[PDB]
Design a protein around this nucleic acid. Sequence first.
RNA 1: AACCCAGAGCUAGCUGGUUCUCCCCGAAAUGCGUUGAGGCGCAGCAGUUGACUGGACAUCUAGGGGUAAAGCACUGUUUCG
Length: 62
Amino acid sequence: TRFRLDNLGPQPGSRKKGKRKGRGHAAGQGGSCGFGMRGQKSRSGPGIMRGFEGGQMPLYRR
RNA sequence: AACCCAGAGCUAGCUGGUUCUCCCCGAAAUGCGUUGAGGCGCAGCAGUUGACUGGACAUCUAGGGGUAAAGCACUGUUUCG
Ligand SMILES: [Mg+2]
Ligand SMILES: [Mg+2]
Ligand SMILES: [Mg+2]
Ligand SMILES: [Mg+2]
Ligand SMILES: [Mg+2]
Ligand SMILES: [Mg+2]
Ligand SMILES: [Mg+2]
Ligand SMILES: [Mg+2]
Ligand SMILES: [Mg+2]
Ligand SMILES: [Mg+2]
Ligand SMILES: [Mg+2]
Ligand SMILES: [Mg+2]
Ligand SMILES: [Mg+2]
Ligand SMILES: [Mg+2]
Ligand SMILES: [Mg+2]
Ligand SMILES: [Mg+2]
Ligand SMILES: [Mg+2]
Ligand SMILES: [Mg+2]
Ligand SMILES: [Mg+2]
Ligand SMILES: [Mg+2]
């Protein structure tokens, strides 16, 4: 048969690899995994609530 | 305000750590607000993608100010006769 288990493959641009952060600096995303220095967005856990404005009265209340 | 076990991998806007390679582009430490000030949101500045534009550099001209300088005509201050 023309098509066979060992002559197939995906269309280019259809299946990217996926960023494996924390696997060196040459990979691109560094050791900090692309979150900068220490802060609140860089911590392991739930972040700020979407709409939160640092104690400022958010737009869904004013 | 005992010890052991469990809820419990409690929570930690705080420390520390986060592993292979090459190529291209490439910041910001400013403003507003905040039970906020070593945090966050938006704007500003990056990258990438798309659309619409033709400007940028240089030269000349025009337009309104009230700084430097200058001055004592006003407001104050001041020397001598
Ligand atoms: Mg880098
Ligand atoms: Mg390292
Ligand atoms: Mg990132
Ligand atoms: Mg660190
Ligand atoms: Mg940050
Ligand atoms: Mg947290
Ligand atoms: Mg929630
Ligand atoms: Mg833990
Ligand atoms: Mg619990
Ligand atoms: Mg460069
Ligand atoms: Mg600052
Ligand atoms: Mg600067
Ligand atoms: Mg308040
Ligand atoms: Mg208050
Ligand atoms: Mg602040
Ligand atoms: Mg701050
Ligand atoms: Mg810092
Ligand atoms: Mg803090
Ligand atoms: Mg921001
Ligand atoms: Mg002057």
